[PDB]
Amino acid sequence: HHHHHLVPRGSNPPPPETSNPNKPKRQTNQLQYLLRVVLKTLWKHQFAWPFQQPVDAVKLNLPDYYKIIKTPMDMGTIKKRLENNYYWNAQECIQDFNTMFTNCYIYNKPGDDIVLMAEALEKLFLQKINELPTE
Numbered sequence: 001h002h003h004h005h006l007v008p009r010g011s012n013p014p015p016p017e018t019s020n021p022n023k024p025k026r027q028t029n030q031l032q033y034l035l036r037v038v039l040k041t042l043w044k045h046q047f048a049w050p051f052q053q054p055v056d057a058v059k060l061n062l063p064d065y066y067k068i069i070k071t072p073m074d075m076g077t078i079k080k081r082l083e084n085n086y087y088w089n090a091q092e093c094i095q096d097f098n099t100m101f102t103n104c105y106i107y108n109k110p111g112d113d114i115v116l117m118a119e120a121l122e123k124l125f126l127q128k129i130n131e132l133p134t135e
């Protein structure tokens with residue numbers, strides 16, 4: 001038999017939403033800080049690049065990635081959500097960052113370059129979180 005299962009192919013899943021008209025949203029001091037300070041400082045960091053977009057498992061030849069990671073998250077998505085005022089409070093945005101970092105620690109092994117990157121970005125994240133406005 002001449003069906004060799006070379007098709008259909010893999011794909012990336014649809015990315016997380018960055019808009020949702022029926023989701024409750026607010027602008028708050030803490031969320032403005034999360035954009036202007038937290039996100040924009042991490043974004044410009046030389047370790048940000050693996051985290052600036054939804055994981056392209058096809059390009060990166062990581063065919064197990066979405067088998068293991070069922071709650072993907074990335075800073076491109078977070079940036080767009082903040083630009084679009086998607087969040088109700090700071091907790092929802094912080095949880096997105098925590099998901100991103102946790103995914104990295106699940107998927108990879110301690111000492112991998114990508115884990116060293118996430119650790120540095122997380123350290124910076126936590127330092128900036130400690131100066132969140134308390135008004």
Ligand SMILES: COc1ccc(Br)cc1S(=O)(=O)Nc1cc2c(cc1O)NC(=O)C(C)(C)O2
Nearest residue numbers: 050051055060062065103104107108113114117
């Ligand atoms: C061999 O690919 C590497 C090696 C080191 C680094 Br740093 C980055 C790459 S890659 O970007 O070409 N592939 C790659 C990217 C990864 C990961 C593993 C990779 O091989 N692990 C991850 O958690 C995500 C998806 C965020 O980033």
